[PDB]
């Protein structure tokens, strides 16, 4: 795994000692080389995980997320120009090296063995995102966005450390196998309830759950495109990855103590799909869509079926690609007009006649068009929750209907019916944004053909 | 039904694009002998509706209603099929009368043309389809059920009875439309014409409720 | 009421401008553009038919539980095409 | 740019200066400026409009924004995202609203009651059950190869 | 070159479209006449529907009660 | 028809209920009148893959119908006399079922009303 | 001859049978004249800043900006917790949550007790 | 669905449907004629004429204009504006 | 029968060329309506044959291949079945849509 | 709600009622002859009290006329297939491309259509040549401190174009 | 783009529903119709467009001859 760690380090002084019109080809080319390098990883088989050291290992939950991260970096790096290319050279280098250090702590986090190392690399994942969104937050409340961001994620993720140290000095070391192979059930004393509540509540904060989802929308409407893609895709599915690992312990009380969180997640999934039907600020609709999909994820995690975990990890990867793509299209539209609102930029079936093809393709993946991965995820989660209860399918189908309607409203609101004919500044589509769309929607369809890779440990 | 209404929609679109995409039955009145390929096409289609005995439209509709009559039915659905066959007869005859054999009410500078190879090929092909394919398909099916075939009297005649009384009923409505009185809406007229009340009520109440709850309760 | 004379005059200047524009819009320099620079049925009902007929012998029969037929119904007056033996005919009919 | 005092803190009181400022600010008639009032639901100080306004505004005026009936300077009623045509069409109905709902509920209730009257009272053409040849067609239903013969016969009638 | 438009008069009809219109109507009517007469009798049911069963008490099996 | 109108308006006793037609014990006015021949050779009826609710009476007409239809396939309009005769056999089956209906109807009516209007 | 067209929140009141359009006082003429004057001046400003051949960007309507800033950012100021606000908040925020919570408790206790009896149809229920 | 309109053709069609109207004459029917001064007909039948144009050509004209056409030349001009009559 | 499965799968695969063709063409074909009409006609004439074979004998058969995510006790392949409905509905739909291809050649001449 | 004045008037209000009732009588009445009869009957009904020197009785009869009209309207009033509400409602809006485009083309296609783009360039120079002085002076010259009208005066002064004309002239041709 | 103008004073209305309804409105006492417009709708190739059962009786003019030939076949 150090074969992946150390070139991610050595991509950083590259960016320092390259010059003007020389950083760019180096960073993008070499990051795509690292994408091939981790495409080499996928060997995992049968009995167990694969151990890349006495320190690192990979579960098959971790392999598609790690490949998704090293796929998403060069896409992101090309995406984050034309809004900072006119800024200074040293600040641009600092931005690129910030993203590289960010990816490095993401690889650190996904290839964890011990949960304490996982926690250190969790908040090391946190700290570059803060600096990016605050330095290039590009709107008047990036102050409040970063402040809400860091205080929610730390103050939720703070007692998780205490609970993990307590588990450390009551059950030996914290390798995932020695967390396994030795775990004993823990009864319904209230200390067990608070310990489970601490761990599960910290990752509830990081998903988000419904009672703590206003962490999200300021932190995406007042962020640059790179930090937004990082935050949405890699950080929310990293929180899901963490709960998927640490839910191995404390199974004999999660049945008794999991009842309020499921109901909060279900009714809040309905309320969040309702709240993103009527808002302006088009950038935020993807954020509330993300809250809806993560509520479905949390339903899938707290029910404990292998069907549920397969559907959960498929929903994770497909929604990560969908949200990162659709953030990039919203950034394209904001590069067109300086509005960020929804009802202003209209028309665009005439003009840019193939940008609409990418909007349609993203909107139908967010619809969960049926050969795609998102319908695979949502379908197996609905199957597992109907085996959980014979009644919850009302909420799932009503989520499906309202999700169809707001995704279609996003499609046919801003890009259907009449141009406002006082715009007269939008350029025809560059090769760059079309290349970014092509980097998004080739792997999603190629996994739609052969999806046996991305299913979880319970394959 | 597939052969049937594909041919019917295609004839309708032929008429509509023949008359400058105006599409409405008022301001369309008399178009018989404005070339009668399309008028022949529509009278073939709309008399294949209810099954002029016995064509392709006869077999499906009338064996369905007589087998429903020879079944442990729900005693109200039989009367529903009765009234529905009468209704489909009367609007079929009314749409033929108002479309073709009325008096010509359509704006001037006529540009009617159907000397057109693709349209005569398509309409030819589907009238030849909808005249033979019902008998051809219905003949060589493997018998997947036991046909009844043993009906009482005044229960096999009733199909043709309802279609003929529908023709006569729409005919007398037509010959009252020839009169001049300027009658008034009696609210069953309004219930029939204005979709009665379901799309208006649902499409003006169900959007307003969920978005009243979206603004006050949910968002703000 | 009627137009004011100012509206009439303004409107006729717009008449002249709109007619000059629309007459400019009909391009006709006598050259609009300029250029800078059995087989159907044969290939389509042979070549995918050849490829699918190659696909539907070999790979599809090496996958064992694959394309399978609901059985050809045998009738009591027939005989078996494969080895050859008859099925006994049906018995007495009467009172039809 | 944008002026700081073109934002909007606080409701109506007091009446001279704040209503004069809102008339200068939202570009409205002075005594047609209506706050909601202040029940503390948020809502700022934004005006109340005649609330339907979109199957109104008859389409031959030739304003600026062709599919929204805008005129670039109207104060734009709070619930406009629910009022773009393609979302909610509040046309003046050809009949009523109460007459609509009462006749629709009456017709659907009567038809479902006649469905129940049908469900308790079937039709049948007067014919007994079929004469299945081998013990109500046994050995070709769900299984039972040699478990129990189930003797039942038919007699010629 | 092709057909012309006229103003407030009855439009002209070329002979081909009208002769195939009459042909298709007459061949529908010939088909339904020949099919109504050749074998079926699809209006009827080809077999006499009986009375209530036979109205024959002391037949079909009863005791004299 | 009007028989169902009588069954819904009038007394529901003498009009028999469907799907519970066998009520009276058999051969009450028959005695010794039964053949039920059924010479349709059930093993052959299963050998040719027939359908449920076709493993019934008049089966050998269907056997020869499918046999002549298979054996004369390009003669598209060949087998019609066997089709008509199978229709006639099922017509006789339908007549026999109607006779069974009004048998049990007139038994229930005349027997029960005779006993309870002379007792 | 007509029940005088009772209105609703959905059925708009058409321009014909108001019947306030027929009691024309001088105040209505004054209001219509001033409203036409306001629309005239706004269309004048917009058309002069709309037909400029050097104007590259968008016309930047302050009406849309003002409505958006009133809609999103100008909610949390201003506010006071009233009886109506707190009542509707605890009703439409907590009510459905606790209702769905109790009914899933009921369904889960039914299914747990019933499969604790063992008489459920899980003879093969593999895909759990 | 595009037959070409022209100024002579629209002039002929409008004058045809004016001449077909009853209470005017085919003698004193000028292109430059008033619906108020010399033809002498009232506002009511003037808007009946406006209705005849709307029902022939297939589009409404607004009532901001129907006050103030009053002559056939401005009728031809206004349908020339609605249709933008050049090839 | 190899003929039966072969002709049904090529009735499927004849509706695969033109989409990828004009996704791969970039040189705008003039005869594109004629091309789509003649490939629908070829699909029709290939679909007429096995339905006649079906009514001729029976031989009522399913195809099933390329299983993906055969994960738990289930599996799912791309699989479709020639019984009676999916057997002999397809010629009617192809025939109807072929005539609509003619009518939409004419009706959409001006776009 | 109209650009000219603050109201229609009584006269045009009665006139719009007459147009609507006559149109609804079209939508009610087929065969056109009994239609012509009933239209002349309606004309006589308005001829009964046209010459009222009173005004309040006239507007009260207007309100009662609106009541008997709204009681007697049609479910589908016959809207023409070019009107809003009708069958078209910008039917061929697929090709109603605004003309601020067509300059953002590659110069290969600008070489494909040379004369049209040369004449369009001199159109734009005509636009910019008389944009500042005449147009903005005539806008900030005539009216009161409040404009209070939605019309605008022409350029009757000497020469060039009436002001604010570009998005009026350069519209789609409504059948492309 | 010529049209040749099929002209006025030619229609001369006389079309029997319009003429009889001008009779009825004359007995009513109005005598002020729209006039000679709709004779292009009431004569020409128009003027007793066939009744509704005639379009259904239209089928056997070529039909009965073919049917008698097929009976003889
Ligand atoms: C549908 C139901 C519609 C029927 C309406 C009910 C009938 C009510 C009437 O008779 S109209 C009510 C008031 N009528 C008036 O004429 C008011 C005064 N109007 C006039 O004098 C006009 O005719 C003018 C001013 C001469 C019009 O001049 P234009 O012609 O130069």
Curated annotation (Swiss-Prot), chain A:
It comes from the Eukaryota. Keywords: Electron transport, Membrane, Mitochondrion, Mitochondrion inner membrane, NAD, Respiratory chain, Translocase, Transmembrane, Transmembrane helix, Transport, Ubiquinone. It is found in: Mitochondrion inner membrane. GO terms for cellular component: mitochondrial inner membrane; respiratory chain complex I. GO terms for molecular function: NADH dehydrogenase (ubiquinone) activity; ubiquinone binding. The chain crosses the membrane at residues 22-42, 60-80, 98-118, 147-167, 196-216, 224-244, 256-276, 284-303, 308-330, 351-371, 391-411. It is a multi-pass membrane protein. Its EC number is 7.1.1.2. Belongs to the complex I subunit 4 family. Core subunit of respiratory chain NADH dehydrogenase (Complex I) which is composed of 45 different subunits. This is NADH-ubiquinone oxidoreductase chain 4.
Curated annotation (Swiss-Prot), chain B:
GO terms for cellular component: mitochondrial inner membrane; respiratory chain complex I. Its main location: mitochondrion. One of its GO terms (molecular function) is NADH dehydrogenase (ubiquinone) activity. Keywords: Electron transport, Membrane, Mitochondrion, Mitochondrion inner membrane, NAD, Respiratory chain, Translocase, Transmembrane, Transmembrane helix, Transport, Ubiquinone. The keyword Secreted does not apply. GO terms for biological process: electron transport coupled proton transport; mitochondrial electron transport, NADH to ubiquinone; mitochondrial respiratory chain complex I assembly. Disulfide bonds: none annotated. The chain crosses the membrane at residues 1-16, 35-55, 82-102, 126-146, 154-174. It is found in: Mitochondrion inner membrane. The keyword Mitochondrion applies. Belongs to the complex I subunit 5 family. Core subunit of respiratory chain NADH dehydrogenase (Complex I) which is composed of 45 different subunits. Core subunit of the mitochondrial membrane respiratory chain NADH dehydrogenase (Complex I) which catalyzes electron transfer from NADH through the respiratory chain, using ubiquinone as an electron acceptor. Essential for the catalytic activity and assembly of complex I. This is NADH-ubiquinone oxidoreductase chain 5. The gene is MT-ND5. The chain holds residues 332 to 551 of 606 of the full protein.
């Amino acid at each position: 795994m150090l074969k992946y760690i150390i070139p991610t380090m050595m991509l950083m002084p590259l960016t320092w000692l390259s010059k003007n019109s020389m950083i760019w080809i180096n960073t993008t080319l070499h990051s795509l080389l690292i994408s091939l390098t981790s495409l080499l990883l996928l060997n995992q088989f049968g009995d167990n995980s694969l151990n890349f050291s006495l320190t690192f290992f990979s579960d098959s939950l971790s392999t598609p997320l790690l490949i998704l991260t090293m796929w998403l970096l060069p896409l992101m790096l090309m995406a984050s120009q034309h809004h900072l290319s006119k800024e200074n050279l040293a600040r641009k280098k600092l931005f690129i090296s910030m993203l590289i250090l960010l990816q490095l702590f993401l690889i650190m986090t996904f290839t964890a063995t011990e949960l304490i190392f996982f926690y250190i690399m969790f908040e090391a994942t946190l700290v570059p995102t803060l600096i990016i969104i605050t330095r290039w937050g590009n709107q008047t409340e990036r102050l409040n966005a970063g402040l809400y961001f860091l205080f929610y994620t730390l103050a939720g993720s703070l007692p998780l450390l205490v609970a993990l140290i307590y588990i450390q000095n009551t059950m030996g070391s914290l390798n995932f196998l020695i967390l396994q192979y030795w775990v004993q059930p823990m009864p319904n004393s209230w200390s067990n309830t608070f310990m489970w509540l601490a761990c599960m509540m910290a990752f509830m904060v990081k998903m988000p759950l419904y009672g703590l989802h206003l962490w999200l929308p300021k932190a995406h409407v007042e962020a640059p495109i790179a930090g937004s893609m990082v935050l949405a895709a890699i950080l929310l599915k990293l929180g899901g990855y963490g709960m998927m690992r640490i839910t191995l312990l404390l199974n004999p009380i999660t049945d008794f103590m999991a009842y309020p969180f499921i109901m909060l997640s279900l009714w809040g999934m309905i309320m969040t799909s309702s709240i993103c039907l009527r808002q302006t600020d088009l950038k935020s609709l993807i954020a509330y869509s993300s809250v809806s999909h993560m509520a479905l994820v949390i339903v899938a995690i707290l029910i404990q079926t292998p069907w549920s975990y397969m559907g959960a990890t498929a929903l994770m990867i497909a929604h990560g690609l969908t949200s990162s793509m659709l953030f990039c299209l919203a950034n394209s539209n904001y590069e067109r007009v300086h509005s960020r609102t929804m009802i202003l930029a209209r028309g665009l079936q005439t003009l840019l006649p193939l940008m609409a093809a990418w909007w349609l393709l993203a909107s139908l993946t967010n619809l969960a068009l049926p050969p795609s991965i998102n319908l695979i995820g949502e379908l197996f989660v609905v199957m597992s929750t109907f085996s959980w209860s014979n009644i919850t399918i009302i909420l799932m189908g009503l989520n499906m209907v309202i999700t169809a309607l707001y995704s279609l409203y996003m499609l046919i609101t801003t890009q259907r019916g009449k141009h406002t004919h006082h715009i007269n500044n939008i350029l025809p589509s560059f090769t760059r944004e079309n290349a970014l769309m092509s980097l998004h929607m080739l792997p999603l369809l190629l996994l739609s053909l052969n999806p046996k890779i991305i299913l979880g440990p319970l394959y | 039904h597939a052969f049937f209404k594909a041919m019917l929609f295609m004839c309708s679109g032929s008429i509509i694009h023949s008359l400058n995409d105006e599409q409405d039955i008022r301001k369309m009145g008399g178009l018989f002998k404005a070339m009668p390929f399309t008028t022949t096409a529509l009278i073939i289609g709309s008399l294949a509706l209810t099954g002029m005995p016995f064509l392709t439209g006869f077999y499906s509709k009338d064996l369905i209603i007589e087998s429903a009559n020879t079944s442990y039915t729900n005693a109200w659905a039989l009367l529903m099929t009765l009234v529905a066959t009468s209704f489909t007869a009367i609007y079929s005859t009314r749409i033929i009368f108002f479309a073709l054999l009325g008096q010509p009410r359509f704006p001037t500078l006529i540009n009617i043309n159907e000397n057109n190879p693709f349209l005569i090929n398509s309409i030819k092909r589907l009238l030849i389809g909808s005249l033979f394919a019902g008998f051809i398909i219905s003949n060589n099916i493997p018998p997947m059920t036991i046909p009844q075939m043993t009906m009482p009297h005044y229960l096999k005649m009733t199909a043709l009875t309802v279609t003929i009384l529908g023709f006569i009923l729409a005919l007398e409505i037509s010959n009252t439309t020839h009169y001049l009185k300027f009658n008034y809406p009696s609210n069953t007229f309004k219930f029939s014409n204005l979709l009665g009340y379901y799309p208006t009520i649902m499409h003006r109440l169900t959007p307003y409720m969920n978005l009243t709850m979206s603004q006050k309760s949910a968002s703000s | 009421s009627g137009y004011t004379p100012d509206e009439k005059l303004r409107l006729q200047q717009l008449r002249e401008l709109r007619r000059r524009w629309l007459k400019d819009q009909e391009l006709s320099p006598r050259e609009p553009v300029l250029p800078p620079r059995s087989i159907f049925a044969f290939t389509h009902v042979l070549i995918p038919v050849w490829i699918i007929h190659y696909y539907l012998k070999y790979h599809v029969t090496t996958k064992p539980y694959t394309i399978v037929e609901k059985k050809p119904r045998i009738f009591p007056g027939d005989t078996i095409l494969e080895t050859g033996e008859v099925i006994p005919p049906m018995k007495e009919f009467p009172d039809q | 740019s944008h002026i700081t005092k073109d934002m909007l803190p606080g409701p109506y009181p007091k009446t001279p200066e704040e209503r004069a400022a809102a008339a200068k600010k939202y570009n409205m008639r002075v005594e047609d400026y209506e706050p909601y009032p202040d029940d503390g639901m948020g809502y700022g100080d934004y005006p109340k409009l005649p609330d339907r306004s979109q199957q109104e505004r008859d389409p031959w005026y030739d304003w600026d924004h062709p599919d929204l009936r805008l005129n670039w300077g109207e104060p734009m009623h709070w619930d406009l995202d629910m009022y773009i045509r393609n979302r909610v069409d509040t046309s003046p109905t050809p009949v009523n609203w109460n007459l609509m709902c009462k006749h629709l509920f009456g017709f659907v209730a009567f038809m479902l009651f006649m469905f129940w009257v049908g469900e308790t009272y079937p039709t049948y053409q007067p014919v007994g059950p079929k004469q299945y040849p081998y013990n109500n067609l046994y050995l070709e239903r769900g299984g039972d190869p040699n478990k129990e013969p189930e003797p039942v016969v038919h007699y010629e009638i | 070159a092709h057909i012309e438009p006229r103003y407030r008069q009855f439009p002209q009809l070329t002979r081909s479209q009208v002769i195939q219109a009459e042909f298709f109507s007459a061949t529908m009517w010939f088909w339904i006449l020949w099919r109504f007469w050749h074998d079926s009798d699809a209006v009827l049911g080809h077999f006499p529907y009986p009375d209530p069963s036979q109205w024959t008490d002391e037949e079909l099996g009863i005791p004299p009660d | 028809g009007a028989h169902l109108a009588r069954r819904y308006l009038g007394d529901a006793s003498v009009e028999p209920e469907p799907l519970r037609m066998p009520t009276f014990p058999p051969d009450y006015g028959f005695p010794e009148r039964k053949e039920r021949e059924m010479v349709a050779t059930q093993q052959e009826m299963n050998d040719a893959q027939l359908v449920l609710q076709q493993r019934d009476y008049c089966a050998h007409y269907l056997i020869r119908f499918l046999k002549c239809k298979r054996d004369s396939f390009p003669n598209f309009l060949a087998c019609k006399h066997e089709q008509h005769d199978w229709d006639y056999c099922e017509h006789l089956d339908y007549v026999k079922r109607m006779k069974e209906f009004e048998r049990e109807r007139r038994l229930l009516q005349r027997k029960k009303r005779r006993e309870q209007r002379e007792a | 001859s007509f029940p005088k067209y009772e209105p609703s929140r959905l059925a708009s009141l058409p321009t014909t049978l108001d019947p306030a359009e027929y009691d024309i006082s001088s105040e209505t003429r004054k209001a219509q004249a001033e409203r036409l004057a306001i629309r005239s001046r706004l269309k004048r400003e917009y058309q002069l800043q709309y037909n400029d051949p050097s104007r590259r960007g968008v016309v930047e309507d302050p009406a849309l900006i003002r409505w958006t800033c009133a809609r999103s950012a100008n909610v949390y100021p201003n506010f006071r917790p009233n009886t109506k606000t707190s009542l509707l908040g605890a009703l439409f925020g907590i009510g459905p949550l606790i209702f769905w919570y109790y009914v899933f408790k009921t369904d889960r206790d039914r299914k747990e007790k019933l499969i604790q009896e063992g008489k459920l149809d899980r003879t093969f229920n593999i895909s759990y | 669905d595009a037959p070409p309109l022209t100024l002579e053709g629209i002039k002929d069609r409008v004058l045809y449907v004016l001449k077909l109207y009853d209470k005017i004459d085919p003698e004193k029917l000028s292109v430059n004629s008033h619906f108020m001064k010399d033809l002498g007909l009232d506002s009511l039948d003037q808007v009946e004429i406006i209705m005849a144009m709307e029902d022939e050509f297939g589009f409404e004209i607004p009532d901001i204009d129907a006050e103030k056409l009053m002559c056939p030349q401005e009728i031809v001009d206004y349908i020339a504006d609605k249709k933008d009559v050049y090839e | 029968m190899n003929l039966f499965s072969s002709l049904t799968l090529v009735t499927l695969i004849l509706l695969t060329m033109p989409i990828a063709a004009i996704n791969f063409n970039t040189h705008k074909f003039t005869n594109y309506p004629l091309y789509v009409k003649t490939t629908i006609s070829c699909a029709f004439i290939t679909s007429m044959i096995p339905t006649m074979m079906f009514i001729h004998t029976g031989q009522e058969m399913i195809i099933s291949n390329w299983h993906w995510l055969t994960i738990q006790t289930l599996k799912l392949s791309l699989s479709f079945k020639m019984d009676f409905f999916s057997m002999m509905f397809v010629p009617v739909a192809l025939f109807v849509t072929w005539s609509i291809m003619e009518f939409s050649m004419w009706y959409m001449h001006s776009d | 709600f109209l650009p000219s004045a603050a109201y229609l008037t009584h006269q045009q209000k009665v006139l719009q009622l007459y147009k609507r009732a006559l149109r609804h009588l079209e939508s009610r009445c087929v065969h056109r002859d009994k239609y012509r009869y009933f239209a002349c009957l309606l004309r006589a009904r308005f001829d009964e009290h046209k010459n009222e020197k009173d005004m309040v009785k006239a507007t009260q009869l207007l309100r009662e006329a609106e009541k008997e009209f709204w009681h007697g309207q049609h479910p589908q009033p016959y809207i023409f297939p070019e009107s809003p509400g009708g069958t078209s409602y910008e039917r061929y809006e697929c090709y109603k491309v605004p003309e601020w485009c067509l300059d953002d083309w590659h110069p290969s296609e600008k070489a494909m259509y040379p004369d049209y783009f040369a004449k369009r360039e001199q159109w734009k120079k005509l636009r910019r040549e008389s944009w500042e002085r005449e147009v903005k002076q005539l806008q900030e010259e005539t009216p009161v401190g409040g404009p209070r009208t939605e019309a605008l005066p022409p350029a009757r002064k000497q020469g060039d174009l009436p002001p604010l004309w570009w998005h009026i002239v350069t519209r789609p041709r409504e059948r492309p | 783009s010529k049209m040749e103008l099929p002209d006025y004073k030619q229609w001369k209305i006389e079309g029997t529903p319009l003429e009889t309804v001008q009779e009825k409105l004359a007995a009513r006492g109005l005598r002020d119709p729209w006039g000679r417009n709709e004779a292009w709708r009431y004569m020409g190739g128009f003027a007793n467009n066939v009744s509704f059962v005639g379009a259904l009786l239209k089928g056997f003019k070529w039909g009965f001859a073919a049917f008698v030939v097929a009976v003889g076949a």
